[PDB]
Amino acid sequence: PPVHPFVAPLSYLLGTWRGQGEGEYPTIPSFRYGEEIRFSHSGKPVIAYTQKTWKLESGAPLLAESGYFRPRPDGSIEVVIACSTGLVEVQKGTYNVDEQSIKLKSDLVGNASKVKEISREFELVDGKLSYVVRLSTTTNPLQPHLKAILDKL
Amino acid sequence: PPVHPFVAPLSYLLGTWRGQGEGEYPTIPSFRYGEEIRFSHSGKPVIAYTQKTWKLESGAPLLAESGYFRPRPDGSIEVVIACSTGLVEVQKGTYNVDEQSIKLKSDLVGNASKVKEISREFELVDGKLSYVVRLSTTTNPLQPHLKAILDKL
Ligand code: MNH
Ligand code: MNH
């Protein structure tokens, strides 16, 4: 199906991406992981998102998440994500065509024992997809947790 | 990868399913749809769920959802779902091995303008996957909205 007019400004996402990331938080040792993301669509004003992570050395599965990105022509966007850990997120924010960036902060984080807010920021950098995930808890303010860079396949 | 011991009691779900459903609610005309579901896993105590619906006559896409089922050996289960409409759900309940049923009710429905609670109940009936989705709003009590039967492919 043709790309919906609301999806077209984010058409640079469509496809599959693979790369590597690093995680950290004040309470844990830093770690690395592999990551794969697919963005797809079915002609609606929605982009399907599906992701997985693995251990770099072996390919052993780690986690997975999936959801939907809903951009609008005013530059606003809402993203919903379900995670294999048992969390859900409602993310809201904006996208910027000139910067090829997407900036999101959570309206809600569901079913979490400790996490309070999550922000997710994407940028296309020399054709590669970069992001940063930040998270807070009741006692740790919003701060970096994950960052990755992925090549388009 | 081998099926995780927590997933094994629900191994009857694993695969792809296709069939048809019907929708209704006091405020809308009844409708029919096609549906496809895939349940998969990666050796963790989690089953990935991915679903889509379409118009019967043409195959034209309607909606999609996806998430994760997390069963535990005491018979409890938690399910998280993100939907292409922009909703998320945290579902909790139980599964019953002798009945091949799963009964869930929402702890939380996120980003909904009108929906308050959702229940989802699955049953394997002569090898076919049946479900009922019920929903409430502030003014309409919990009641049937969707029901479908799918054949295993
Ligand atoms: C967005 C999703 C996401 C959320 C909300 C998240 C949240 C957390 C929270 C909360 C903690 C523990 C902090 C505390 O103060 O006790 C933690 C730690 C950790 N996380 Mn992560 N994390 C990921 C993504 C996330 N993690 C991914 C993806 C991976 C790897 C593929 C990963 C790997 C870890 C590891 C490893 C730890 C350390 C183990 C632990 O303390 O639980 N992660
Ligand atoms: C679980 C997910 C799910 C939820 C929370 C849901 C919720 C609703 C709500 C709320 C309404 C409007 C009721 C009101 O009182 O105004 C409505 C109507 C409707 N729904 Mn459904 N619905 C689906 C699944 C869902 N629907 C699926 C799947 C389809 C089709 C593939 C579908 C098709 C419809 C149609 C068609 C209408 C009528 C249009 C409307 O009033 O918006 N649906």
Bridge-based pairing state of the strands B101-110 and B61-71? unpaired
Q: Would you state the structure tokens that stand for residue B139, as one six-digit string?
A: 């003014």
Ligand 1 contact via A33 beta carbon (within 6 Å): yes
In terms of C-beta distances under 8 Å and separation of at least 24 residues, what long-range contacts does A57-63 make, across chains too? A59/A34, A61/B1, A61/B42, A61/B43, A61/B44, A62/A33
| A66: number of Cβ within 10 Å | 26
Determine the distance from the C-alpha atom of residue A19 to the mean position of all C-alpha atoms in its chain, rounded to a whole number: 13
Nearest to A126 by CA among A1, A2, A12: A12
Burial of A104: CB neighbours in 10 Å, binned 0-12, 13-18, 19+: buried
Letter for the amino acid at A152? Answer: K
Q: Note the resolution in Å, 1 decimal.
A: 1.1
Do B89 and B118 form a contact (C-beta atoms < 8 A)? yes
Q: Measuring CA to CA, how many Å separate A128 from each of A12, A16, A31?
A: 10, 11, 21
Using the structure block, give the residue that is written with the tokens 């959570």.
A106
Ligand 1 contact via A142 beta carbon (within 6 Å): no
Do A64 and A51 form a contact (C-beta atoms < 8 A)? yes
Q: After which residues is chain A broken (C to N over 2.5 A)?
A: none
**Sequence-separated (6 or more) residues with CB below 8 Å from residue A144:** A24, A132, A133, A134
Nearest to A131 by CA among A55, A34, A21: A21
Bridge partners, A109 (sequence order): A89
Task: Report the residue of chain A nearest B108, measured CA to CA.
Answer: A110
Q: Would you state the structure tokens that stand for residue B42, as one six-digit string?
A: 């990666």
Three-state SS letters, A19-71: EEEEEEECCEEEEEEEEEEEEECCCCCCEEEEEEEECCCCCCEEEEEEEEEEE
Q: Would you state the structure tokens that stand for residue B82, as one six-digit string?
A: 């993100």
Nearest to B76 by CA among B89, B92, B98, B100: B92
**Sequence-separated (6 or more) residues with CB below 8 Å from residue A123:** A99, A100, A101, A102, A129, A130, A131
Domain boundaries, chain B: 1-153
Using the structure block, give the residue that is written with the tokens 């048809």.
B20
Please tell me the total number of residues recorded for chain B in this structure. 153
In terms of C-beta distances under 8 Å and separation of at least 24 residues, what long-range contacts does B97-100 make, across chains too? B97/B9, B99/B123, B100/B12, B100/B124
Q: Dihedrals φ, ψ of B74, to 5°?
A: -75, 0
CA distance linking residue A18 with residue A33, whole number of Å: 11
Q: Measuring CA to CA, how many Å separate A61 from each of A53, A83, A146?
A: 6, 14, 17
Q: Which residues of B touch A (CB under 8 A)?
A: 1, 42-44, 46, 48, 50, 52, 61, 64, 66-68, 70, 78, 80-84, 86-90, 107-108, 110-111
Nearest to A111 among B1, B82, B107 (CB): B107
**Sequence-separated (6 or more) residues with CB below 8 Å from residue B58:** none
Determine the distance from the C-alpha atom of residue B112 to the mean position of all C-alpha atoms in its chain, rounded to a whole number: 18
Q: Which residues of A touch B (CB under 8 A)?
A: 1, 42-44, 46, 48, 50, 52, 61, 64, 66-68, 70, 78, 80-84, 86-90, 107-108, 110-111
**Sequence-separated (6 or more) residues with CB below 8 Å from residue B74:** none
CA distance linking residue A41 with residue A60, whole number of Å: 28
Q: Find chain A residues with C-beta within 8 A of B90's C-beta.
A: 88, 110-111
**Sequence-separated (6 or more) residues with CB below 8 Å from residue A116:** A109, A135, A136, A137, A138
Q: Measuring CA to CA, how many Å separate B69 from each of A126, B15, B72, B79, B126?
A: 37, 14, 10, 4, 22
CA distance linking residue A92 with residue A70, whole number of Å: 10
Do B152 and B129 form a contact (C-beta atoms < 8 A)? yes
Q: Dihedrals φ, ψ of B42, to 5°?
A: -135, 30
Letter for the amino acid at B12? Answer: Y
